[PDB]
Amino acid sequence: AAHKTLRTKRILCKAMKVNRPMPQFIRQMTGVRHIRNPLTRHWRRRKMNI
Amino acid sequence: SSVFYVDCSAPVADKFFQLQEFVEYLQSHMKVDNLRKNLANKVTIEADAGKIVVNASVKYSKRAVRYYARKFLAKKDIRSRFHVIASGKDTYELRPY
Amino acid sequence: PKQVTTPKEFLALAARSDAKWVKVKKASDDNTKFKLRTTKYLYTLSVKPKFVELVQNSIPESLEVIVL
RNA sequence: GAAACUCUGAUGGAGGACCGUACGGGUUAUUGAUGUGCAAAUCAUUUUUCUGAUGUAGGUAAAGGUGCGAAAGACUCAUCG
RNA sequence: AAACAGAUCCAGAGUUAGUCGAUCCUAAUCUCAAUAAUGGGAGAAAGGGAGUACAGUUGAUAUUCUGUAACUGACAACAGUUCGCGGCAACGCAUACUAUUUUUCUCCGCCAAUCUUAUACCGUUGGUAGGGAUCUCUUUCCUACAUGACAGUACUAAUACCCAGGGAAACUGGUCAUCAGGCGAACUGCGGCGUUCUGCUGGCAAAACAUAGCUGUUAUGUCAAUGGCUAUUGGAUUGGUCCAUGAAGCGAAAAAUAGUUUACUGGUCACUCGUACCGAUAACCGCAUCAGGUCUUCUAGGUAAGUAGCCUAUGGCCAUUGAGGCAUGAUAGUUCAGGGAAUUCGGCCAAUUAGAGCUGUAACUUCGGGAUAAAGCUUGGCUCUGAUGAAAAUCAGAACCGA
Numbered sequence A: 001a002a003h004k005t006l007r008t009k010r011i012l013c014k015a016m017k018v019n020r021p022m023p024q025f026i027r028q029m030t031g032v033r034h035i036r037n038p039l040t041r042h043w044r045r046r047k048m049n050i
Numbered sequence B: 001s002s003v004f005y006v007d008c009s010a011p012v013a014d015k016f017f018q019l020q021e022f023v024e025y026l027q028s029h030m031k032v033d034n035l036r037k038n039l040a041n042k043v044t045i046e047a048d049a050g051k052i053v054v055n056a057s058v059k060y061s062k063r064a065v066r067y068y069a070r071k072f073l074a075k076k077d078i079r080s081r082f083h084v085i086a087s088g089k090d091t092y093e094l095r096p097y
Numbered sequence C: 001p002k003q004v005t006t007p008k009e010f011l012a013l014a015a016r017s018d019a020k021w022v023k024v025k026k027a028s029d030d031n032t033k034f035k036l037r038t039t040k041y042l043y044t045l046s047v048k049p050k051f052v053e054l055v056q057n058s059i060p061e062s063l064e065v066i067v068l
Numbered sequence D: 001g002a003a004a005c006u007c008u009g010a011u012g013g014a015g016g017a018c019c020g021u022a023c024g025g026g027u028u029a030u031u032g033a034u035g036u037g038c039a040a041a042u043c044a045u046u047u048u049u050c051u052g053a054u055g056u057a058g059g060u061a062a063a064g065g066u067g068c069g070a071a072a073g074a075c076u077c078a079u080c081g
Numbered sequence E: 001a002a003a004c005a006g007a008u009c010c011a012g013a014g015u016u017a018g019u020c021g022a023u024c025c026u027a028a029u030c031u032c033a034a035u036a037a038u039g040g041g042a043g044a045a046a047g048g049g050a051g052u053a054c055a056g057u058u059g060a061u062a063u064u065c066u067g068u069a070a071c072u073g074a075c076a077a078c079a080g081u082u083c084g085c086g087g088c089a090a091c092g093c094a095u096a097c098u099a100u101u102u103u104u105c106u107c108c109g110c111c112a113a114u115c116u117u118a119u120a121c122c123g124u125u126g127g128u129a130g131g132g133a134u135c136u137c138u139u140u141c142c143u144a145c146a147u148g149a150c151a152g153u154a155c156u157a158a159u160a161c162c163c164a165g166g167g168a169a170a171c172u173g174g175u176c177a178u179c180a181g182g183c184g185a186a187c188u189g190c191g192g193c194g195u196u197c198u199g200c201u202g203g204c205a206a207a208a209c210a211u212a213g214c215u216g217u218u219a220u221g222u223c224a225a226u227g228g229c230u231a232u233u234g235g236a237u238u239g240g241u242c243c244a245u246g247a248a249g250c251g252a253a254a255a256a257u258a259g260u261u262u263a264c265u266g267g268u269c270a271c272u273c274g275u276a277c278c279g280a281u282a283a284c285c286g287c288a289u290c291a292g293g294u295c296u297u298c299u300a301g302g303u304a305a306g307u308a309g310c311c312u313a314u315g316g317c318c319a320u321u322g323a324g325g326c327a328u329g330a331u332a333g334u335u336c337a338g339g340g341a342a343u344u345c346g347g348c349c350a351a352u353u354a355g356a357g358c359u360g361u362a363a364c365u366u367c368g369g370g371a372u373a374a375a376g377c378u379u380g381g382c383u384c385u386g387a388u389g390a391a392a393a394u395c396a397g398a399a400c401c402g403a
Helices: A006-017 A024-029 B011-013 B019-027 B062-075 C009-012 C052-058
Strands: B002-004 B052-058 B082-083 B090-096 C021-026 C032-037 C064-065
Touching: A006 C052, B002 B062, B011 B090, B019 B062, B019 B090, C009 C032, C009 C052
Parallel strands: C021 C064
Antiparallel strands: B002 B052, B082 B090, C021 C032
C-alpha cells in the first residue's frame, strides 16, 4: 500500500471485517461457552502472510 | 518637510504624563545625525489648545517618533495601560485596552 | 485569459451567442475592466474613464451584467 | 641562439594521484565495553576507502554431486569438504 | 514503577480524479505458433508516455470535493470565410486525403570549465504596519513587504546557425581555455531564425495575508531603489576522455514520388482500478514497542575551505520509575612533583605533533617522485593606511594595547 491491486484489496477487506469479538447471542442460543473467533488477530503481533 | 502628531487626550486626564514633561523629554532625547541636544532648525516641539507638534525640516522618520513615545511609557510605569498605535497617516494615538 | 485592446473587437466577441456574462470591475489608476466570459476564454478589456460610459451602453442588452 | 631549439612567468586542468566529509562502502587496533548482551556477531574510541576494477535499487538469468566463485573449500534464506 | 494516557481494549466512522499513477509501448528475459510461414502474447506503479493550476473546506479525503481559471482527446452536425500569395535570400503567411519509400523528433555515457533565469540566503539605500526590550545605553530588535498553471507582443541584448552586400599578410577577429577564416574573415543590415533575458500587461485582487474598529462585514496597507566575489536547480556555450563510443518500441510530424482532391476557423462526452496512515524515531525485516539492518526526496543563520565539529530561530520534543546516600569497586573521563620505556613477549596504550602565511627542503630515483621530507619562524585585540576589481570582497603594510 498504497498502489494495492483490487484482489489484494479484497483480501485486506475480508481480513478486517472478520476481525472482531464473537457475538453474545450464540452463547445464549447454544449454551456452549469458551468459543473464540479463530480469525481474530492483531496487526503488530501476527502477520497475515497474504 | 514633514510634520507628525501623537494624540494624548486619553493619557493626560487618566494618569500622570503632562505635556510639559513629555515635550521636555523629547527635547533632550530625540536626536539628528546620531547626536542628542542638537536641534537648531532640525525639529521644533510644541502644544496648543485642550497632541504634540513635531515639525521636521530635515529628513526624519515617523518611526523615530514611535520609538521615543514608547520609551516614555515604560519610564512612567504606564505600560500595560496605554500603547502607541496609528490613527492615520502622519498621526499616532495612545489608546487604552 | 486573453486581453483585447480595441473596444470595437470586444463588441464582436460579445454578440457570438457563446457569452454568459460580462463583469464590470473598478481598477488601479481609476480604470475599469470589462471581463467578457466565453466558454473557452475570459476576454478582458482595460479602458480609461473617458470612454467608460459609452461602452456599457454598447454592450448587448440580452447579456447579463454583474457589477462589483 | 648562426642554427637545431631551450631558459623565465602565466594559461590550462590530465591522473584506476593525494588529504577529507556521510544514516556511503569496508572492519585494523584497544585482543576496551558487553559476554544472565540492546544484539543467536552489538556498542564506544581508533582505523581504511571515498569518480572509481565504485556503491546501490528494482526487474531478470544460472539449482544440489549441480550453480556461482579477483579461489577463503568461500557462498547458495541464522544450515555447506 | 504509576496511569484518568496510549500504535492497547470496545463501538462506530473514513480513502471522491478525462489531466497524479495503473491501463498503452517495448528492454534484459520468458513462452506458444507457423514453415502456404517472416509472427502473436507476456515482461517496468523509478525507462518511454497527450493533458491542471491556484484559493477554500473536514473530526479523518484532496493536484481527486466546492469556487474560479485553463488544457487534451474522441464523436457529431452547423454557421461564416476560402478556392495561393509575399521576401534578392535566410524565411514569412489561411489550407486536404490514401499509399509507398526516406528522414527527423521521442533519443540517450562519464568528467571538467565559463555565462545566466528561478528559488533560498547575505547585502548596501530608505519606509510603514504591529509586537518584544529599557536602572543606564540602543532614531534599536523581531515578524511582514507576496502573485499560480495558462495566454499575449513590445523594443531593449545576448549567444548559436544561416542569408544579402563586403573581398582580407603591415594577417585580422575571438575565448576563462582550445581557436576561426578565399569551401569566404573583419564589418554593415532598424537581415532571417531558434533558445534564453529585461520591461509591460491579461490571470489579478474579487482571492490571500497583516494591522484598526464594529456585529458577519467596513476601512486603510502589502511601497521605492539595486548589488551579490554565496549556494542549489533549470538552461546555454564549449572542451576533454575510451583496445569503454554509452537502449528499444509504440506513437507523432515532415518530405519526395504517384493518384484522388476544395479547405479552414468557430456543441456533447470522457469508462475501468489505486488514493486513509507509518516509511523505522514503537507502525517494515530481526519471536518483542530489539542501541541491529533496509531505497529516496525538500534542506535556514553564525563560526570555517566546508553537506566537518560547535551554537541558535522555524518545526518537533522532556522518548527516560521515583525518594535518599556517596566509603569501596567496575566503567567512561580531566590532572599528576622528579625521572622518561627502567614496565612489557612488544612504546600495547596514551601523550607530543597539527590549520594557515612566509622561509627552507637531504640521500636515493624507473627523473614522474621522495615532499606536508626534515628544520625554523609568524598568528590576538583595537585605531588606521594603501593596492586590485563594478563590486558592499580579499591582500598587503604600520601604529598602539596587556598575564
